Amino acid sequence: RRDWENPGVTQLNRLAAHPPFASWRNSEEARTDRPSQQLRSLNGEWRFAWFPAPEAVPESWLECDLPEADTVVVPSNWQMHGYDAPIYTNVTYPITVNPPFVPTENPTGCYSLTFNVDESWLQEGQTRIIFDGVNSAFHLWCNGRWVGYGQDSRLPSEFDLSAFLRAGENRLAVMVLRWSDGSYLEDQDMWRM
Amino acid sequence: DEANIETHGMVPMNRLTDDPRWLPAMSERVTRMVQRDRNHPSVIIWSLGNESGHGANHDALYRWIKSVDPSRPVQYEGGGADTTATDIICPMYARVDEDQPFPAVPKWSIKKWLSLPGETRPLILCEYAHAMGNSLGGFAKYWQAFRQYPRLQGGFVWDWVDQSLIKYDENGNPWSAYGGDFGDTPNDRQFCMNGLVFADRTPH
Amino acid sequence: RRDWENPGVTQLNRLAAHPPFASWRNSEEARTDRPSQQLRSLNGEWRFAWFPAPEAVPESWLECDLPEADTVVVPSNWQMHGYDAPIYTNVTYPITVNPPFVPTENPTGCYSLTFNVDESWLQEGQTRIIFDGVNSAFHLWCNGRWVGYGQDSRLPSEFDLSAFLRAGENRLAVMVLRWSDGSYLEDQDMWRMSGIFRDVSLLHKPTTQISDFHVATRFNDDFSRAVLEAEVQMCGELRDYLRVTVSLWQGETQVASGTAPFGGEIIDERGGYADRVTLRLNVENPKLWSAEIPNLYRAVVELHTADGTLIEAEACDVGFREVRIENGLLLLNGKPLLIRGVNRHEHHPLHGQVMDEQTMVQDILLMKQNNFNAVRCSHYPNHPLWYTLCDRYGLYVVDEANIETHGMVPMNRLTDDPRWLPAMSERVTRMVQRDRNHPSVIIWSLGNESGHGANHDALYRWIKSVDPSRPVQYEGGGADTTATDIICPMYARVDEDQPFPAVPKWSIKKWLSLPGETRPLILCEYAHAMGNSLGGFAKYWQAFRQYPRLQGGFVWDWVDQSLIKYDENGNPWSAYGGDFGDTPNDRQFCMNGLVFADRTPHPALTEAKHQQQFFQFRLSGQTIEVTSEYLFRHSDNELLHWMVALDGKPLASGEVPLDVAPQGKQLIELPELPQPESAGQLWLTVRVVQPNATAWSEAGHISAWQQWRLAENLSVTLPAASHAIPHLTTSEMDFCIELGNKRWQFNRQSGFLSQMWIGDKKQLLTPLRDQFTRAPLDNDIGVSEATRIDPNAWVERWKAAGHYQAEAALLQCTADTLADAVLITTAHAWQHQGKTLFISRKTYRIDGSGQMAITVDVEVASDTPHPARIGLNCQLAQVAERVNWLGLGPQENYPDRLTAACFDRWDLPLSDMYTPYVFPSENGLRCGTRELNYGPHQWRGDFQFNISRYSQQQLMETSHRHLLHAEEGTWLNIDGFHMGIGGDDSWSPSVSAEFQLSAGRYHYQLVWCQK
């Protein structure tokens, strides 16, 4: 569906937006703004591999860590890890202007993470994942299964993972496209990363 | 708080913002921001984005915000800084006393802008005193005007910090890099460095 | 992908919307609107197969026809072909409410077509296919490859097939889903059908082409000068030799022209549109457009080369007119409109929702002939030809987006949700992009019954911004929200407030002056014409006339949405909700029109025509004053015909030319009028006649009328001899009166006139008894059901009080002989389980002339609901051919719906005294009658009556007219008083107090005699 070449599609299966949440199960904790046992950070060491275009991504990646990937810190901009160059352009777009299309050579970041989920999170309620910022568009899979897609590099994209996760170890796969139709609305004078 | 919408490189600038096919994509960039940030007391004004001309999509979104969150004014500079899509005249780089009468989108002296026939809004520059390198010449002129004219309510200097990036010489020595320094081409060179502080936050 | 369960996806690969194109390659054809070889119709015989769900469609269908498919005509709605049933639901959604999902059992219509394409269409340029209307969603494939998808059942979906076609034979495959996420935006009160219901066409455009054009007209203050501005956009490769020429013609003369290369003015820091250009043409003394005189010009848009070679031409009809709201009033060309509108759905009893030119023209002509000047597109953009017709015949139009979410809880659940903004936005923007150059369209509407949500505010502003020439209206959320330029309530009453929480319906008079309010008020819906209705219609017109800011409304609605069904012999019958096995359904609520489905009028149409008259009159002695309500035309196709008659006997008559300027007055002096040398009331009747034919009427068309009572000469003279005295015979069981031929028999056990004879001939089939009820109208029933009773409905109040089950108990029955007559006196009480409801006291006096005078005095308990009527009824033994009466007519008329009827002597066939409303009820009443004639019988007095072969009992026991059967003899209902019928709405009591029989004591008298 090449969803990243269609301004009619800015997301798939994304949950509604809302103010910052933490689902405290203790009122005092919410009152004092302490950490919540229900809001976990997945930031830290993830696996990452760079590709020149979405078409170059191997299907095996969906189910298996790519041995060539590297372990990197997330969050991060892949240009700052040296995978490709960041671009400094002010007004002129960094890609040919031909909405809603983007170059066929579109740098693609394949991120993945193996992590654990407590059984208590699955026995009751809903578990969702939240991406505070992904530039500029991405598809998300969980345990080899496709979950959804999102655009707008500067607002959080949330997906319900309740039906995709298992107690114990799980593996997320995130395919991030450098350029998308969202890039046409992201022409700010700053480094393009 | 400003929506993630900037289409500066279009010709003309409002080519997408005036096209209803892009209204949906624009809309989510504004609505989802309001839905995430509306409870923060620090946010006093919403902005529809930047440098995307003035298109009908901006008017509709201006109205959507006014209707859902009446507690904060809405501003937007595109299309000449005083369009129907803004509660505040919010020019970028309009001078104190000197008019810059560009066609369609003039930048009048801020003192004169306030009093154009029929105008009554407050004026706050969304960007002024471009702090690129050895700059800020005439900064006091703005302040003096802001103090004297009630409706000149200030502005947002451009900008806080140089966007330079660290590079390492052959011998591992870090240095400050700018456009083109990564083989990026075309590039706009040192225009990414416009701040009041260097990237490491040491002051200029 | 299940795109049909995702409001974020409303289409795939669909082309941008634009005004009607034809890609002419000859300027003249463009100018004269001739057909274009570049625009072909694919309408006709297609292959179709029905499936219960998209998952059941075989892959095979993509490449080859299904042996099981049938061959059917397109356009069509599959329910009209019998594949599945159409559903009649008003508010509640026809599918479970669970957005954005729809049922997994989702009727899918697989349509296919094998057609030829000339290689010349493929060798260059672009070939697109155009689906004007597919309900509700669909996927398209061509020669087996997938092309795209589209939603919004009421706007065209276009796709470029350039790369999919081959020279020679090609095959299209269209998978149409009955239900989709767009259905949540399509909850209009009408049959729920589906299919490819509007035209399908193929359009060839060059590669370098006119992709859009917008025409505007601005004027000077007195409209003596104008400027036509045409913005034109192209697609294709720009070249410096490219040019655009816009020429404007008045008939065959070119009045103006402009040519320029592409490149618009600077818009912003980045420059301007290199791919657009705006031509400006001055026009002095333009012929202005209005519904009164729909002057049109022709704008031709040519794309060509500097050296003069034509690339392609597009064009449109242009109506020079300005619409604006100023100082609280809606102005057209500077003058305040008075909207005589009607809401009109696209409906055909045989074809469902497919529209055809003939039906459209029929509708427009009837409208115009009945004094309507406006139509509201309830509640979706219409078939494109509609607008063409309105532009040329002259009707003001409200174009309305296809968005209705009535069934939601609360109603704005989706409209206030930003997730639905995209979907809603296209239903609005694409309509504007399509219809913006039609002069008939004067107001845009955001949709209907979808509460008021932030999405509406955003869209309101969008239109305001893109097309400042037309006000925007929207009724949802209380009719005067921030999303409407016009206070446009539905069913707000004239004087009575309905203070519902959050969305009150104030009296329209009161609404205008609420603190801070300043907008004009035009009802988007009023005078719900369901069944025997429009009672109180005149109350609206008087108010519209008196208050400048009350600028009219759109009656609900034009035509009944009944559908044709056939009995065992093949005779067709009118069907309503539930008739196709659809359930749940809203029964007869789909029939609310001024006209039946086949365009035969209901009697209420005439009440509208009269109230909507364009000439008003006053009478002072011999002077008639005519006032014109036209804003722009002089009465140059009008003369006034006047006639004076005494008790229907024509005394004198004449004609006078009318020469009244718009908004002017003319005084007409009537001659001396040789007063009647006899008793009776003289009546003056005037009619405005159009001597000359028009595009919408025949020579002789009557456009307005009015009557007045002139001198009355009461009769004093009494004479004529006591020839014979009647004889009275008394038995224990009866009182018997005889005079010559005639005999009258009163039963002493029941106290009623039980039989009457002429000669040896019996005359009654059922005795003459008092009657206080009527077979309930739709307004009397409202939304009450056996299953869910509405105790507030009139019918319910009546039933509860025992009105229909009341038993007459005899209190008194005496016979007295007078000097020249026999006097019978009776008294009955009607009671219900102990309570006395009514008491009827009468006297019957039979004199030597054989005349029976009946006096009746009735008491109605103050505490029982006011009765439907106070009259007598019987079943006459005989059936005669004509009915002749001196009174109001000739059509059916009720107390609150009689202004259009005229007092005169009328004579019609019996059949005519019965109005065949599809859901039967009391009908055919005629009021203010002084003499009625049927057979040898004659009744004189001052009453109301109805006469037919159907008993009230039967009308009330029968749900469909086709099931009625003539009874023996003739049922005559003769009323001294009859309650109003109401109609302000059909879901709550709407009969105004002054029309309820609440006086407590009532008197009437009749004289029955033979002929």
Ligand SMILES: CC(C)S[C@@H]1O[C@H](CO)[C@H](O)[C@H](O)[C@H]1O
């Ligand atoms: C270079 C001008 C023509 S556009 C100018 O460039 C600046 C460069 O720092 C900033 O980005 C301003 O916002 C932009 O208007």
Ligand SMILES: CC(C)S[C@@H]1O[C@H](CO)[C@H](O)[C@H](O)[C@H]1O
């Ligand atoms: C019956 C009311 C609660 S809703 C009422 O139904 C009518 C039935 O013809 C029309 O559809 C009106 O537009 C609607 O307001």
Ligand SMILES: [Mg+2]
């Ligand atoms: Mg996209």
Ligand SMILES: [Mg+2]
């Ligand atoms: Mg910029």
Ligand SMILES: [Mg+2]
């Ligand atoms: Mg959809």
Ligand SMILES: [Mg+2]
């Ligand atoms: Mg409705």
Ligand SMILES: [Mg+2]
């Ligand atoms: Mg024709």
Ligand code: NA
């Ligand atoms: Na100030």
Ligand code: NA
């Ligand atoms: Na900069």
Ligand code: NA
């Ligand atoms: Na009025």
Ligand code: NA
């Ligand atoms: Na209805």
Ligand code: NA
């Ligand atoms: Na005349």
Ligand code: NA
């Ligand atoms: Na009935």
